Amino acid sequence: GPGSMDMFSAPDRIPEQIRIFFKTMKQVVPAKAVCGSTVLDVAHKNGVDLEGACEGNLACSTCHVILEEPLYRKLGEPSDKEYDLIDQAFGATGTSRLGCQLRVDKSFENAVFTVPRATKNMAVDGFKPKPH
Ligand code: FES
Predict the structure, then answer these.
(1) From ligand 1's centre to the CA of 99, what distance in Å?
(2) 3-state SS class at 103
(3) Which residues contact 37 (CB under 8 A, 6 or more apart)?
């Protein structure tokens, strides 16, 4: 019975828990990552003001945050498109752009999440008749 059984459809199986770090423009604070939780969900408990708190709302332009050099490297790198896109920015690293949905795993051990961008707040809007 030569079989592989390597791949599985049970991603819910989260490994041991780890600890992460929340770095902001003001300072960096410690964060605890528990199996079954999420980074964005952690920042809420620790108090870190992580950009998000949205569940498919309309207030969403683009998601781009800075992540650990190595953590992001192994986590995955951008493609040609994202390469030139970010390459156009001033001293912009591919680790500055990412999605908006991650889980807590062993690979997140000592993971550093740098949030250079600011959080959403009271701000007028409507001055966009013909946005290029
Ligand atoms: S969750 Fe709203 S832009 Fe990322």
Answers:
(1) 8
(2) coil
(3) 104
Structure-token pair, residue 26: 């003001």
Q: Ligand 1 centre and the CA of 19: distance in Å?
A: 23
What are the residue boundaries of the structural domains of the chain, listed by start? 1-132
97: CA distance to ligand 1 center in Å? Answer: 12
Quote the DSSP letter at residue 54: -
Pocket test residue of 41, 51, 55, 61 for ligand 1, highest count of atoms within 8 A of CB: 51
Among 56, 55, 75, residue whose Cα is nearest residue 65: 75
Q: What is the three-class DSSP state of 2?
A: coil
Closest ligand 1 atom, residue 55 Cα: 1
Give the start-end residues of each E strand in the chain: 18-24, 28-33, 66-67, 112-115
CB-count burial class (<10 Å; 0-12, 13-18, 19+) for 22: buried
Q: How was this structure determined?
A: NMR
Protein residues with CB under 6 Å of any ligand 1 atom: 52, 54, 60, 63, 100
Residue 55 token pair: 């569940």
